[PDB]
Design an enzyme around this catalytic site. Structure first.
Site, PDB file in Angstrom:
ATOM      1  N   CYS A   8      14.767  37.656  34.830  1.00 62.27           N
ATOM      2  CA  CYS A   8      15.220  38.617  33.891  1.00 62.27           C
ATOM      3  C   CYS A   8      16.451  38.403  33.155  1.00 62.27           C
ATOM      4  O   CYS A   8      16.544  38.844  32.110  1.00 62.27           O
ATOM      5  CB  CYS A   8      15.244  40.405  34.818  1.00 62.27           C
ATOM      6  SG  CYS A   8      13.456  40.853  35.282  1.00 62.27           S
ATOM      7  N   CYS A  95      55.945  27.356  34.372  1.00 60.10           N
ATOM      8  CA  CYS A  95      56.387  27.120  35.957  1.00 60.10           C
ATOM      9  C   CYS A  95      57.359  28.131  36.399  1.00 60.10           C
ATOM     10  O   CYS A  95      58.108  28.517  35.589  1.00 60.10           O
ATOM     11  CB  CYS A  95      57.018  25.719  35.821  1.00 60.10           C
ATOM     12  SG  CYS A  95      58.054  25.291  37.221  1.00 60.10           S
ATOM     13  N   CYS A  98      61.550  26.437  36.771  1.00 64.88           N
ATOM     14  CA  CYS A  98      62.026  26.069  35.499  1.00 64.88           C
ATOM     15  C   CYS A  98      61.812  27.063  34.281  1.00 64.88           C
ATOM     16  O   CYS A  98      62.665  26.868  33.162  1.00 64.88           O
ATOM     17  CB  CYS A  98      61.967  24.679  34.982  1.00 64.88           C
ATOM     18  SG  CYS A  98      60.224  24.264  34.505  1.00 64.88           S
ATOM     19  N   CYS A 138      54.571  20.552  37.807  1.00 63.83           N
ATOM     20  CA  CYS A 138      55.377  20.709  36.358  1.00 63.83           C
ATOM     21  C   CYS A 138      55.912  19.388  35.958  1.00 63.83           C
ATOM     22  O   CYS A 138      56.429  18.665  36.895  1.00 63.83           O
ATOM     23  CB  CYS A 138      56.305  21.698  36.599  1.00 63.83           C
ATOM     24  SG  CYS A 138      57.462  22.082  35.140  1.00 63.83           S
ATOM     25  N   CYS A 141      59.833  19.693  36.397  1.00 69.53           N
ATOM     26  CA  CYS A 141      60.436  19.669  37.537  1.00 69.53           C
ATOM     27  C   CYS A 141      59.837  18.344  38.392  1.00 69.53           C
ATOM     28  O   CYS A 141      60.419  18.173  39.488  1.00 69.53           O
ATOM     29  CB  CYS A 141      59.830  20.717  38.309  1.00 69.53           C
ATOM     30  SG  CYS A 141      60.429  22.458  37.918  1.00 69.53           S
ATOM     31  N   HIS A 195      17.238  45.141  37.943  1.00 69.16           N
ATOM     32  CA  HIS A 195      17.016  43.698  37.507  1.00 69.16           C
ATOM     33  C   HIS A 195      17.763  43.674  36.058  1.00 69.16           C
ATOM     34  O   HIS A 195      18.187  44.803  35.473  1.00 69.16           O
ATOM     35  CB  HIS A 195      15.686  43.318  37.247  1.00 69.16           C
ATOM     36  CG  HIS A 195      15.044  44.427  36.506  1.00 69.16           C
ATOM     37  ND1 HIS A 195      14.237  45.451  37.060  1.00 69.16           N
ATOM     38  CD2 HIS A 195      14.741  44.604  35.128  1.00 69.16           C
ATOM     39  CE1 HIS A 195      13.559  46.094  36.290  1.00 69.16           C
ATOM     40  NE2 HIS A 195      13.837  45.404  35.074  1.00 69.16           N
TER      41      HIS A 195
HETATM   42 ZN   LIG Z   1      59.083  23.450  36.331  1.00 73.29          ZN
END
Ligand SMILES: [Zn+2]
Lengths: 239, 595
Positions: A8, A95, A98, A138, A141, A195
């Site tokens: 269906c 992130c 940071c 990241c 980082c 359905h």
């Molecule tokens: Zn970062």
């Protein structure tokens, strides 16, 4: 032996697609595509048997397969599936260490979201926290940190095929108005429960495909009467 | 599931190799502690006398040291790390005494109530533990019993935490944006301070826990009355998130810093009078007031840079140059693994480029400031060796990790590995043996071998046994394995998949490549070592198929081998052929031809 999914469901997608006029016109004017073509010719020249003329989520499978078909027979010779359905989304990742934001654009033929529809598409959507055993690497980082991920639509498609995994007849994206033209839904109740069903716009009224019977229904019987396996699908055509 | 890792570095890393997360100043000894993203805590002398302010390194953590707290009049340091542990240090002698392991994710923040010698720890796992410091320092190898106290309610990851001096109030800041307040004596919830619209990385309480200052990634500083349970002032002096706060003894002036690099001193009673103290060179992570004198004379500042600056306070910026500077070292910010899976090229923050030997765990040469990518392409060699380690740059140094899934994946010939070829070596297997070379249990004669017989790592190399995703189990230096403590902890921590190779001296599995062999322009099914050279297949063909002095020579003379229509070099191995030339799918297919 390959499973396309719920019968269906697939039939409802096919029906919804027939009432996406620009998709209809271009397949009529045209593998998996040749079968789709013949099926639509029949309809234009029984609903429950549509899919037979032809499990990953069927719509996305269908559009991408046509995209690949059309990209390939383009190579031998903006495919039309793209100019109808293709939009662009941007995934933001922030992130939390940071607080640097990085962006990645992605093309899409259909769009999934997990507030309101209007508020979603106009702002941010699919907010997600990356943490615990799935932190974000990241590049600032140079290590795994927690992150906030969110999605914004960058380029709106001609037809917006929206997966929701309360729906408005008109969508205001200001700069673009969208009209609802089709719905694929699994009703919890009402006289179509059980359905997947397709509800479509035809000229200036609404049709409902239930198994083998097409029936007119009154506008706002829609949101007056309409729990799911693959969520439900809203097709919006821009004005 | 246990991984082995090790750090490639010098025996002494005097300078931070990454940014600094937190700072502590001991006023009795004039010592500054820095908590490094390079996983090292360091003690500095802050006398403008000494030319070399370095005093010592405190080395145990495996990942970022996110927070530190000096307790007990500078006797005790407590540290929080991204390796999920809290550690207890003798701060005078600079060694680790205990490791608390109740956290299950990065420990992000520590809090301290001086009048109770009470500390608390909190991290991304949403847990907050309270610890009596005198109970922690009293821990010994016999008095090994510890009991816990924790706070509940945090619905999200904790990024900051403060207690007042009296230990009657504790507050956490998190991505839940709400500040949560408890009585630390009873762990009872007191209140929820709502107002911030983002993460809160900085918290302060006045001495009697009636006021709170929060600094937030929404860019605001907020002053709270705990008696009214509400915000009584909002200060908007920054452009981006506030990450760091300090306050004077009178709780009347707030020093703030964060992502926009600017550092302000703002009067709380009268916001408009505020002073730009300086603009730092990188986002500010933490600040520590010199509290020699009431109006504090200076502020120490940690940033994402490895250098640490003291700025003087005598009142368009107030200061343009730091008053003292503790020097930092460079971070490795870019890394390239060569095709031999054995050497690495790096670039650091000074744009210096170096070449390293992962296998011998050491530097090979400094290349100075050459172009990094031109240097990569210059050292390109067309060879394939399966991946067998991973590298991470999270501490700013090279950390190499071995996992059971692919540690033993790379067999190479001794000759291609640069070792005496008077013979197949497994790289991961040799390394494991070098890392555990001083472990007596590995000194085994297979019918006595010590080490791997081809190389050593430097004896000072840190060797780390950790769980995938987070938790360090045990860390020692390579040379120390013969210790009685070290041998005991190794027996308990070294996973059976390392024992297999290092103790039992068991060979890892070989790897073979199935391939087709068929005439160029009769398809045979073969299999051979992944290191088998094309020449051997040529000989195959010469001998057993087109077979109408040395055979290798005749084979080379008569038979030409092809893959994807390219004529193959007889010295190339199958591995390399499949990786660089086979451009199709399914099994490698070689074509043979009569020259
Ligand atoms: Zn970062």
């Amino acid at each position: 032996l390959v499973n396309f999914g719920n019968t269906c469901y697939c039939n409802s997608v096919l029906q919804a697609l027939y009432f996406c006029r620009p998709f209809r016109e271009k397949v009529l004017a045209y593998s998996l595509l040749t079968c789709l073509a013949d099926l639509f010719h029949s309809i234009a020249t029984p609903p429950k048997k549509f899919i037979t003329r032809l499990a990953h989520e069927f719509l996305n499978y269908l559009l991408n397969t046509i995209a690949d078909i059309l990209q390939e027979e383009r190579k031998q010779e903006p495919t039309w599936v793209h100019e109808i359905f293709q939009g662009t989304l941007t995934n933001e990742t922030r992130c939390l260490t940071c607080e640097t934001i990085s962006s990645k654009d992605e093309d899409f033929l259909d769009l999934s979201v997990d507030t309101s529809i209007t508020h979603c598409l106009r702002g941010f959507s699919n907010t997600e926290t990356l943490c615990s055993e799935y932190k974000y690497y990241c590049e600032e980082c140079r290590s795994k940190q927690e992150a906030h991920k969110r999605m914004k639509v960058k380029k709106l498609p001609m037809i917006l095929a929206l997966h929701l995994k309360v729906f408005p007849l008109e969508l205001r994206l200001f700069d673009r108005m969208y009209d609802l033209v089709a719905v694929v839904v699994h009703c919890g109740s009402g006289p179509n429960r059980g359905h997947y069903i397709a509800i479509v716009k035809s000229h200036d009224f609404w049709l409902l495909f239930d198994d083998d019977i097409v029936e007119k229904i009154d506008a706002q019987a829609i949101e007056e009467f309409y729990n799911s396996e693959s969520g439900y699908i809203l097709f919006y055509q821009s004005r | 599931k246990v991984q082995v890792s090790y750090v490639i570095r010098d025996e002494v890393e005097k300078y931070n190799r990454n940014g600094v997360n937190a700072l502590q100043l001991d006023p009795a000894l004039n010592r500054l502690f820095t908590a490094g993203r390079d996983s090292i805590i360091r003690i500095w002398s802050v006398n403008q006398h000494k030319q070399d302010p370095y005093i010592a390194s405190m080395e145990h953590h495996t990942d970022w040291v996110n927070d530190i707290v000096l307790c007990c009049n500078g006797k005790t340091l407590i540290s929080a790390s991204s390796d999920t542990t809290v550690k207890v240090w003798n701060a005078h002698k600079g060694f680790c005494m205990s490791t608390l392991r109740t956290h299950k994710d990065y420990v992000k923040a520590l809090a301290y109530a001086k009048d109770k010698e009470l500390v608390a720890s909190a991290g991304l796992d949403r847990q907050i533990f309270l610890w009596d410091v005198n109970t922690l320092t009293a821990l010994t190898a016999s008095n090994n019993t510890v009991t816990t106290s924790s706070l509940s309610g945090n619905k999200d990851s904790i990024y900051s935490l403060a207690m007042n001096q009296l230990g009657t109030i504790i507050v956490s800041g998190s991505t839940e944006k709400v500040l949560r307040v408890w009585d630390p004596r009873t762990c009872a919830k007191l209140m929820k301070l709502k107002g911030h619209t983002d993460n809160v990385k900085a918290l302060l309480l006045n001495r009697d826990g009636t006021q709170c200052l929060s600094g937030s990634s929404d860019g605001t500083i907020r002053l709270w009355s705990l008696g009214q349970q509400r915000c009584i002032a909002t200060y908007r002096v920054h452009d981006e998130g506030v990450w760091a706060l300090q306050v004077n003894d009178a709780f009347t002036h707030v020093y703030s810093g964060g992502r926009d690099r600017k550092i302000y001193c703002t009067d709380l009673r009268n916001p408009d009078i505020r002073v730009l103290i300086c603009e730092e060179k990188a986002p500010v992570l933490k600040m520590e007031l010199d509290r020699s004198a009431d109006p504090p004379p200076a502020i120490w500042v940690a940033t994402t840079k490895s250098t640490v600056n003291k700025w003087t306070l005598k009142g368009t910026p107030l200061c343009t140059q730091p008053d003292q500077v503790i020097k930092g070292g460079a971070s490795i910010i870019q890394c390239h693994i060569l095709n031999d899976k054995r050497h690495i090229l790096t670039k650091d923050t000074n744009n210096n480029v170096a070449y390293w030997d992962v296998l011998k765990a050491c530097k090979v040469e400094d290349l100075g400031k050459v172009d990094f990518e031109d240097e990569i392409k210059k050292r390109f060699k067309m060879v394939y060796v399966p991946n067998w380690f991973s590298v991470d740059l999270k501490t700013g140094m090279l950390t190499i990790t071995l996992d059971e899934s692919d540690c033993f994946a790379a067999w190479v010939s001794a000759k291609d590995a640069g070792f005496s070829s008077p013979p197949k070596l497994n790289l991961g297997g040799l390394l494991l043996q070098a890392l555990l070379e001083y472990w007596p249990r590995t000194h085994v004669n297979p019918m006595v071998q010590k080490g791997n017989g081809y190389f050593q790592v430097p004896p000072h190399t840190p060797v780390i046994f950790g769980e995938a995703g987070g938790r360090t189990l045990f860390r020692l230096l390579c040379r120390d394995s013969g210790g009685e403590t070290e041998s005991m902890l190794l027996n308990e921590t070294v996973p059976q998949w390392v024992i297999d190779i290092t103790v039992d001296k068991n060979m890892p599995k070989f790897n073979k490549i199935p391939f087709y062999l068929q005439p160029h322009a009769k398809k045979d099914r073969l299999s051979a070592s992944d290191m088998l050279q094309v020449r051997k297949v040529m000989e195959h063909v010469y001998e057993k198929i087109i077979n109408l002095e040395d055979i290798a020579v005749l084979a080379e003379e008569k038979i030409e081998l092809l893959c994807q229509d390219q004529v193959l070099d007889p010295n190339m191995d199958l591995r390399t052929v499949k990786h660089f030339i086979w451009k199709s799918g399914g099994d490698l297919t070689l074509h043979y031809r009569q020259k």
